[PDB]
């Protein structure tokens, strides 16, 4: 019946004066626009159909055409920015927000989905959806005693839409919308469905990607222990955003970082720093670098949790980007740590893989590593042990590498080298 129509036939039906003919034609459009490959989105836009779909959203008397037109527009809105823009330009936003109240679950769900694609386009559309008042009726759909009674697909869509309202920066979402959304997100973060959990963690990761004030508003909600728990999940799609959120939190203040440690996070790092997914090791090591940038009592906790040998491991062998994060974690540990914490680092065997990484063609990591060596030499001075360290650096071939570096392009680099060379070698 409505399979494989041409655009011209769809146009003909939609322009007929006959609501049933318009409904069949709209459903045909929904079918073109939902096919597996190359849906003809631009052809539908160019035929001028968006304004007719939008006014069909308002047909309370004909719920099937509301659904077909909502689904058609969702898919248009799922494409490029210019395509999402055409949906918005047709007035879709307030019309979808009014469908949130529909007594028909499949229809308010479609409106949720459409609004998520719109808000998902970027900050300006996200904030426009919020100005049109989307958040109150979105949140009313989740106002039930027990999330478990909602259909699973429906809750997943709501969660994902709310996370798009939390997403993007420049600017970040309005502080008041974030405050409005957060209690419902905290509730979603304790739900048992893995996709709900993954998207709740993504939303939390967006909200903590910002200055300390933004981080604080999340941390004040008490979510950190739940995040650390998800950090332990067996599902990679949950671990990845849980770890991103935890990593974002530890770029905040030392007190915000302490909440992550207090919640047990460090005990998960032995598995994270050896995780077979490269991106998990990289972001675990990034996270560690922002903890070793903390107070000496926080460095101490990294030590007590047995994590220095794990840093030595990733420095010795890892994808290069993870290794660059490990080099940072080490330079941070060495500028902030006590002499005894620094001595410990050397006893776990940091020197040889630090030196091996001096052969990399990345000026930044070379800078980072010479800073670290200089820091470690500073500790050895206070102990009168600079010579013991010079030799260690000699024996694993580090001296060769530092010498060469005198003849290096960069200023810090050849500057940093000559200094160590002339100071201890």
């Amino acid at each position: 019946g409505t399979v494989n129509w041409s655009v011209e036939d769809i146009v003909k039906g939609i322009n007929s004066n006959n609501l049933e003919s318009q409904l069949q034609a709209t459903q045909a459009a929904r079918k073109l626009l939902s096919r597996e490959k190359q849906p003809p989105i631009d052809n539908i836009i160019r035929a001028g159909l968006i304004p007719k779909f939008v006014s069909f959203l308002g047909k309370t008397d004909c719920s099937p055409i509301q659904f077909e037109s909502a689904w058609a527009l969702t898919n248009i809105a799922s494409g490029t920015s210019e395509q999402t823009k055409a949906v918005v330009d047709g007035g879709a936003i307030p019309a979808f927000i009014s469908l949130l109240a529909s007594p028909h679950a499949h229809i308010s769900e479609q409106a949720v989905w459409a609004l998520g694609n719109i808000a998902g386009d970027g900050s300006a559309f996200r904030d426009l959806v919020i100005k049109h008042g989307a958040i109150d009726p979105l949140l009313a759909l989740l106002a039930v005693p027990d999330l478990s009674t909602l259909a699973c697909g429906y809750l997943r869509n709501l969660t994902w839409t709310l996370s798009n309202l939390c997403r993007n920066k420049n600017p970040a979402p309005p502080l008041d919308a974030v405050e409005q959304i957060l209690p419902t997100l905290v509730r979603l973060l304790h739900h048992n469905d893995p996709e709900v959990l993954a998207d709740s963690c993504w939303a939390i990761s967006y909200l903590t990607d910002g200055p300390n004030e933004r981080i604080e508003m999340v941390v004040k909600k008490g979510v950190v222990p739940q995040l650390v728990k998800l950090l332990g999940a067996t599902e990679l799609p949950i671990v990845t955003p849980a770890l991103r959120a935890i990593g974002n939190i530890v770029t905040g203040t030392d007190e915000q970082t302490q909440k992550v440690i207090d919640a047990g996070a460090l005990a998960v790092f032995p598995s994270l720093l050896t995780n077979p997914k490269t991106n998990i090791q990289k972001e675990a090591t990034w996270t560690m670098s922002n903890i070793t940038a903390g107070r000496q009592d926080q460095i101490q906790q990294v030590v007590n949790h047995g994590l220095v040998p794990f840093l030595v491991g990733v420095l010795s062998k890892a994808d290069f980007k993870t290794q660059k994060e490990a080099a940072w974690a080490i330079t941070n540990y060495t500028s902030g740590g006590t002499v005894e914490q620094i001595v410990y680092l050397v006893h776990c065997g940091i020197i040889e893989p630090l030196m091996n990484l001096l052969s990399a063609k990345d000026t930044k990591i070379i800078q980072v590593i010479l800073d670290a060596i200089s820091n470690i030499f500073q500790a050895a001075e206070k102990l009168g042990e600079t010579e013991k360290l010079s030799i260690m650096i000699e024996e694993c071939g580090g001296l060769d590498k530092i010498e060469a570096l005198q003849r290096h392009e960069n200023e810090s680099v050849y500057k940093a080298s000559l200094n160590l060379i002339e100071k201890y070698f």
Binding site: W71, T74, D121, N164
Partner: peptide, 7 residues
Amino acid sequence: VAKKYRN
């Protein structure tokens, strides 16, 4: 992905 097409 920020956007999702309904198949």
